[PDB]
Each structure stands twice: as C-alpha cells, then as structure tokens.
Amino acid sequence: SLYGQQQAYAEPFIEMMDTNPEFRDKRSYMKNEHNLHDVLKKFGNNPILNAIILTRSNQVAMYCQPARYSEKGLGFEVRLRDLDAEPGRKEKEEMKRIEDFIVNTGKDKDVDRDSFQTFCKKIVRDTYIYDQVNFEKVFNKNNKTKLEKFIAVDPSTIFYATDKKGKIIKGGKRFVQVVDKRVVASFTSRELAMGIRNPRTELSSSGYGLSEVEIAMKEFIAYNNTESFNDRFFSHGGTTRGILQIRSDQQQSQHALENFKREWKSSLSGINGSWQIPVVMADDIKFVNMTPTANDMQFEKWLNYLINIISALYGIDPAEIGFPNRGGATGDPGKKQQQSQNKGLQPLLRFIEDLVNRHIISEYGDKYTFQFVGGDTKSATDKLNILKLETQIFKTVNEAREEQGKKPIEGGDIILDASFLQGTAQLQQDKQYNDGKQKERLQMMMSL
Amino acid sequence: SLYGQQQAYAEPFIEMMDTNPEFRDKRSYMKNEHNLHDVLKKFGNNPILNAIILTRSNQVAMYCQPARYSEKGLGFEVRLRDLDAEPGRKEKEEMKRIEDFIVNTGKDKDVDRDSFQTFCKKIVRDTYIYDQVNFEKVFNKNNKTKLEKFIAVDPSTIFYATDKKGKIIKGGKRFVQVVDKRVVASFTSRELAMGIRNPRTELSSSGYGLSEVEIAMKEFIAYNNTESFNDRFFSHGGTTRGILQIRSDQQQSQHALENFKREWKSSLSGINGSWQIPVVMADDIKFVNMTPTANDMQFEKWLNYLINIISALYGIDPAEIGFPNRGGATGPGKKQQQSQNKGLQPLLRFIEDLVNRHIISEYGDKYTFQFVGGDTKSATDKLNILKLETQIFKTVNEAREEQGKKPIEGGDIILDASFLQGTAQLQQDKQYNDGKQKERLQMMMSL
C-alpha cells in the first residue's frame, strides 16, 4: 500500500505490465512513454528553464545562513514549537547544535561535504526539472539512532519498490536506486525522503509528481523550433539581396565575365570604391529584389505568448526574466515586484520547510520546529519607541535598565507618568494621616 | 566517494572510458565534448561577457577594504560569531590580525603578492566564465598547521583526481593540476578549495559546476553572426547605390569611356563640382536602384532579444549593460536594489562562504568573516538615540562616560521630570520616616 492499510484501492487494481517486477515505472501522463525522466533530462539545458531555476535558486540561497548570527535577522532558525515556552538551559544548546548541524549538513565540519546552500540549490533544480527531490539520511554505524549526514540524491535514479504482486512495498525497502535498469541500492522510508509538489489522486500516477516540463513540453518544442527558424537565416539561409540581370543577344563567356568581376571589385568594392557608380551599356539591366529591404526577427509575438504561458505555469513574472508581461505588467511593500517575488518564493520556502521538519527535525522530537525567518523592522528607533510605550504602560525604569543589564537605580520602580506620581504623593499623605489618626486613637485609649 | 561514505552511488557505476585513469574529464552536458573549458576559453574576449564581468567585479571591489578603517563603514569585517559576546583583550587583536592577513593576502606584506582586491576580481571572472573557483592554501614549512598564503589558481588546470578503480579520491590527494594532459601537481582537499555556484545531482555531472556560457552558447553564436553580418556591409559588401545605364547604337570604346570619365570627374566630383548638373544626349539614360535610399543596421530586435536572454541568465539588468529592457514598462528598499538583490548579493554570499569554510576555519569557529554595508548612524542619529536612551535608561553620567567625559555632580539622574518628581517625593518620605523614628526613640526613652 502507498500510505497504509485501507479498503479503498489506491493503485490500479489489475497489475499493469511494468518493465521490472521490483519497481514502479515512471509512466508519462498518457502512458505514451515509460522512461519519462530520460526524456525530461534532455530539456534540462533549456535557456528559459535554466533562467528560472537560477533566479529561484539564488533567491532561496539567501536564507541558508542562521538568522541567529545574521545581524539583519535574515536566514533560518530552529525554534520551539510553542511560542509561549521559554527554552531550558539544555534546550538552547540543543537548538544551536541542530542549527550548526544543518548549516554543516552533518555533525562535523567537512569541506568535502555540500553546504546547506549547495543542498538547497540542488533540490530547487531537481524540483523544477523533475518534480522529484530525494536525499539520503546516513545514520552512525555503531548507533543506528544517531544521524550523521544527509545528502541529496539524483532523483532520476529513485523508484518505488514493488512487491511481486505489483503492490508498492510499505514497511520494508520502500525505495530502490536503479542504474542501467538494475537495482544498485535499496532504502527504507527512514533512509530516504521523497518530496513532490504536484500530487495527483489519479490511480495511474502511482504516487509520482508532475513536472511543468511535461505540461509545457509542446510550448518548449515550439520555442526551440522558432529559435532555430530565426537562427537559420545566418547559419543556412540565403541573405542575397537580389539578382542583377544583365541581358544581351548572348550570355558573356566565362572569361569575359570573370574579368568583368575583376573590373567590378577593383573599382567598387569596400570603402575604397564605396561612392563610385558603374556605367554599363548593356541593352537592358534589371535588378530583382528577393528579400525585404529591412530584415528583422519574425514570430516575436509567438515567442512572447509561449514564454508567458511557461512563466504562468512556473508562477513567475516574465518581466523578471526579460520578457514583456502580456498581462500589462503594472503589478512600504518594497515593491509590487517584491510581492510577486514573495508569490514565487513562499511556496518553495514552505516546501523546503515541510521536508526539513518531517525528515530531519523529527529525529529530535516534536518539541522543536524549523522555520525560515525574514528580517524585522525593529531598529533602535523602533525598540526605543516600543519601550517608551512599555515604560508608560508597564515598565519601571529599573525593569528597562535590567533588560539592558544595567543596574537598577534609586528612584526607579516608578512608571513614567505624572498621574502615577500624583497618586503616590496622595498615598503618602494618606499614610501619614492614618498614622496620625491611629496614634491619637491609641493616645486616647491610654488616656481613657 | 565524492562527499562521503554513502550507500547510494554518486558516480557512474561502470567506469566510463575517461581519457586518463587519473582524473575525471569535464564532459559537456550532453557528453558531446570532452574539452569543454578549452571551448569556453574562446569566449573570454566576448564584449558582452566582459562587460558583465567588469561591472560586477568593479562593484565587488568597493567592499574589499576593511570597514573598521573606512569612516563610511563600507567594506568587510571579521567578527565574533555570537552577537551577544564582548570580545576579550586577545580576541580584538586576533581579529585585527586576521583582517590584516586578509588585506595583505598573506602573513607578511609583499608588493609582489596580489592584494585582496585582485584576488576578488580574479575569482569573479572565474565564476562567470567557468563556474569554478580554485585557490591554493600554502602552509608554513616548519609548522604544517599554520597558513602563510592563499593564491588563486587557474580553474582550467584543476581536475578531480580519480582512483585506479575510477572512484574519486577522498581523504588523499583529492585534486590534481593537469597541463598538456600530464599531471604537473597534486593537492589534498586541505590545500585547494573548489567552489561551484550551479551544482547538479546528475550522476554524469561528476560534481562539476555549470557555466551559463555553456547554456547560452547558441545565443552567443547568433550574436557573433549578427554582428559580423552588420559589419560586413562596409568590410566586404557592395555599397554601390546603383548602375547608371547609358545606351546607344553601340557601346563606347574603352578610350571614349575613360575620357568621358575624365570629363565627369573634372566637372562634377567633390565639393568643387557638387551642384553642377551634366547634360548628356545619349539615346536613353536609366538609373537602376540596387540598395535602399537610407541604410541602417538590421536585426536590432534580434540583438535585443538575445542580449535580454543572456542578461536574464546572468542576473543583470539589460540597462546597465547598454541595452534596453524587453521586460517592458519600468514602473526602505528601492527598485535599483532589485538589481543588487539578483546577482550581487549571491556573489557576495558566495565569496563569504568560500572565505569562511576555507580560511577562517584555520582559526576556529569562534570567528566569522562577513561583508558589511554602511549604517545610518550619523551624529544626528546617535544623538537622537541617546536622547531617548537618557529618558528610558541612561543617567547623564552614564552618557558622558560613554563619551569618555568626566561624570558631573548632579548626574546619576534620568532627564525626565517624572523621575525627579519621584525623587523629590522620596526625599520627603525619608525625612518623615526619620522624624517618626526619632520621635519613637524619644518616646521610648520617655516611657
């Protein structure tokens, strides 16, 4: 079973003839193709797709540092789940250790290992080419409970393992690595993550993702063809402006024509000849125009249209990648473009977070959470304004100073409001009155 | 193994026929070519690519100086990791020493060595041509643990070393330098860095990067061709406006035609002849137009389009590189900062990453290297801030002490009327309680 014991079938009830009993083939949407990822790999060098992958991956790269050490606060942090909790002495160190581990992508520092930045770039590229991310988790050999490394794995090699009965294996070796159509490795759900952004209920989807390269494939082919068409003007075309027809009773001999070519080039070619005009006395001379007087690229609108579609599928503004937005462009916040960048980033960030939380942090238990965090508008000005209100509403001078680590002062312990002091000045007199009253009561009692 | 012990294979399981058993070839994406870097070297003189490389490197060069000595605060700094720590007496000097070492690119000052600026410009060029940066780390001869120099190395000469079993070496001499297809040097992972911006999981990528020059190569070829086409009008073309056909019962003899050319030039050429009109009595005269009356460059849109693609791949605005924005309409954070955010910020973060992993790690994890921008902390802003802190936190004397100015009698007070009214209350409270206690004592002695 794919998820677990259920009475609804989640896979094709009759076992389709998979090429191998041991793993599920990555069938194309229409089942026209069984080796889909080897098809898609051919598009991984497309310039538009690479412009998208590079811009997205470079945007995401900016969060890979810990926010803790980043003075602008940008980056990621490992946090307690509850916002209301205060971390214990050991919990703060555990969170710092987990942060360091993630940064190093492993327990020890090792220049031979990917940094987290390289990991994120890899999985971004993999999502946008294949819609399949895999990374292996390697546990300590002496202690299987202790995680040592996580490494990103080539998604084109990872397949669901299938029982001889055609059912996807659960609980056992759920995943296999296949090279040259033989299984070279196997993995449990514990040892390998799989992440998919475009899930399907479709039974024949077999739990695999859905690449935008598959959906847009017609558009990519049309694009490629129009690019080749426009390029072949130089590479293969006839640029010849026209034919100079000279006509007389009989064609000139080849010798005559070649020394006429010599008179021509010796009199008219290059800058040296540039403004001379030949005089010719043939019976008639005609020039036939075979190309437009002014050549330019063709099918520009077609290209724009196509790229607008592809961008709309990937969820990016064409203007971000140097194309006119056919939607008419035109959309404190930074910029509306900044909001559009949030539109692209936020799903991708959430997907990364989800994967990290499910697979890595879950080794440390549910008390922690992994989140990316943006900066904050909490300058010294903002902090001073905030505390300038808290000191009217809540905080005595000494509490404020304590938050700075500055010694409490005699004459603190007061709210900075004149009404508060007028109250305390009242209460002092009230005390002195009650003191007098009670002393005179006692004096009368002693008199009586 | 490429990264470390793993049960998933990260390299071709069957050893592919590499040209040399000792290193992994830098195969082109499609494996159509085996000498990719010798292909890319031919583009290093491209004017567009050089405009990109020069603008980016010039931008980066502004940060090379230490921020510490630059009153505008612009530059780099070496810092403690924790923001909460206050540096010890020895830590401040160690940080200054590390900064100086970086500036000098080495332990001693030596005019023969690259400055940090030259190193930056080099690695920038290498990233944008090859997507591969390498620099060697040279340790002290007496103490192998002590770094003395770091020097940038030609990335086209650096290859991954491979075991005889076709596996990439780990722990040993992971890298070799190959010149003329012979090994001239070898390196451990400790001695040579490799940095790549465009990693791939693809097994056949073999851990190498991916240059945009490889991806954009068709566009570069189309550009070159369109440039040659437009240039060849002058260099090679026929500019001839047209043919003047004169016709009569028989063609003129060559002698007649050459002395007619002499009458022509002697009567009509240059400024001297410029407004005269010839009268000619031939049977018929015709002029055949062979070119447009007004010539200009062709395929301008094609150029703009190609350039815009290359710009989008490189993460640069067409505008700053001499071309218009095909993106269309141009309509605290600013629009101009978007062109830093794409490109420039990643490049800085990449350089920081390399510096931290490879150099600072010699000094241990307590320090961090970072580039730092300026700050909006003029005397006005600092005085406004302290003008608030003196209401919220600071007595007059604490402020003066932070300036190194002597405390004054009558400081130790917050500059708020409510604070003083409080202390004026407390004084009376004290004098009352003093009176009460003295009268208590006097009564006890009376009783």
Q: What is the DSSP string of A375-403?
A: -----HHHHHHHHHHHHHHT--HHHHHHH
Q: Which residues pair with A161 in a beta bridge?
A: A23
What are the tokens at B433?
């309680």
Q: Is B227 marked within a binding site? A: no
Q: How many angstroms separate the Cα of B146 from the Cα of each of A286, B100, B143?
A: 83, 16, 6
CA–CA dist A75, A60 (Å, integer): 10
The string over A303-312, giving b where at least 16 C-beta atoms fall within 10 Å of a residue's C-beta and e elsewhere, is bbebbbbbbe
Nearest to B368 by CA among A70, A427, A305, A384: A70
Nearest to B411 by CA among B396, B393, B401: B396
Secondary structure element (H or E) that encloses residue B178, with its range: strand B175-179
**A319 — alpha (psi -120 to 50), left (phi > 0) or beta?**
alpha
Pairing, β B182-187 against β B175-179: antiparallel
Nearest to B82 by CA among B368, B288, B347, B373: B368
CA dihedral B124, B125, B127, B130 (to 10 degrees): -170
Picking from A92, A112, A150, A293 by the largest number of B CB atoms within 10 A of its own CB, the best residue to mutate is: A112
What are the tokens at A79?
């946090």
CB nearest A154 (choices: B196, B203, B234): B203
- Those residues whose C-beta lies under 8 Å from the C-beta of residue B200, and which sit 6 or more positions away, are A122, A125, B208, B210
Q: What are phi and psi of B301, to 5 degrees?
A: -60, -45
- Those residues whose C-beta lies under 8 Å from the C-beta of residue B109, and which sit 6 or more positions away, are none
Residue B54 C-alpha from the chain's centroid: 9
Instruction: Answer yes or no: are the C-beta atoms of B124 and B53 closer than 8 Å.
Output: yes
Inter-chain residue contact A325 with B325, CB threshold 8 Å: no
- Those residues whose C-beta lies under 8 Å from the C-beta of residue B387, and which sit 6 or more positions away, are none
The number of helices, as runs of H, and strands, as runs of E, in chain A is: 12, 11
Return the axis-axis angle of helices A47-61 and B345-358, rounded to nearest 10°. 60
| DSSP-assigned letters across all residues of A413-427 | SS-S-HHHHHHHHHH
Residue B224 C-alpha from the chain's centroid: 25
Q: How many angstroms separate the Cα of B144 from the Cα of each of B141, B173, B365?
A: 6, 16, 19
Nearest to A101 by CA among A135, A78, A132: A78
| DSSP-assigned letters across all residues of B3-24 | SS--SS--S-SS----SSTTB-
Q: Which residues pair with B367 in a beta bridge?
A: B80
Cα angle value A307/A40/A55 (rounded, 5°): 50
Contact list in B for residue A52 (CB cut-off 8 A) is none
CA–CA dist B355, B76 (Å, integer): 12
CA–CA dist B56, B58 (Å, integer): 5
Q: Strands, E, within B95-166: which ranges?
A: 133-139, 147-153, 158-160
Q: Strands, E, within B214-280: which ranges?
A: 242-247
What are the tokens at A353?
């977070």
CA–CA dist B115, B101 (Å, integer): 10
| Closest alpha carbon within chain B to A325 | B327
Instruction: Answer yes or no: are the C-beta atoms of B249 and A282 closer than 8 Å.
Output: no
What are the tokens at B155?
């990335």
Instruction: Answer yes or no: are the C-beta atoms of B139 and B192 closer than 8 Å.
Output: no
Q: Which residues pair with A247 in a beta bridge?
A: A284
Pairing, β A175-179 against β A192-195: unpaired
Instruction: Answer yes or no: are the C-beta atoms of B66 and B77 closer than 8 Å.
Output: yes
CA–CA dist A224, A227 (Å, integer): 5
Q: What is the resolution of this structure in A?
A: 4.0
3-state secondary structure of B150: strand
User: How was this structure obtained?
Assistant: cryo-EM
CA–CA dist A115, A98 (Å, integer): 14
CA-based nearest distance A95→chain B, Å: 15
Q: How many angstroms separate the Cα of A6 from the Cα of each of A1, A9, A11, A170, A223?
A: 8, 7, 11, 13, 45
What strand order describes the sheet that includes B147-153? B147-153, B133-139, B192-195
Question: Which DSSP state fits B204?
Answer: G
Instruction: Answer yes or no: are the C-beta atoms of A105 and A135 closer than 8 Å.
Output: no
Question: Which DSSP state fits B340?
Answer: I
Q: Which residues pair with B151 in a beta bridge?
A: B136
What are the tokens at B73?
């605060």
Q: Which residues pair with A182 in a beta bridge?
A: A179
Instruction: Answer yes or no: are the C-beta atoms of B175 and B186 closer than 8 Å.
Output: yes
3-state secondary structure of A166: coil
- Look at the block and give the residue holding tokens 């509850």: A82
Instruction: Answer yes or no: are the C-beta atoms of B142 and B116 closer than 8 Å.
Output: no
Q: Strands, E, within B58-162: which ranges?
A: 75-80, 133-139, 147-153, 158-160
3-state secondary structure of B217: helix
3-state secondary structure of B325: coil
CA–CA dist A209, B55 (Å, integer): 41
Instruction: Answer yes or no: are the C-beta atoms of B324 and B318 closer than 8 Å.
Output: yes
Cβ atoms < 10 Å from Cβ of B334: 10
Pairing, β A279-280 against β B242-247: parallel
Question: Which DSSP state fits A187?
Answer: E
CA-based nearest distance B112→chain A, Å: 30
- Look at the block and give the residue holding tokens 């997507």: B131
Inter-chain residue contact A185 with B236, CB threshold 8 Å: no
Q: Which residues pair with B372 in a beta bridge?
A: B75
Residue A330 C-alpha from the chain's centroid: 24
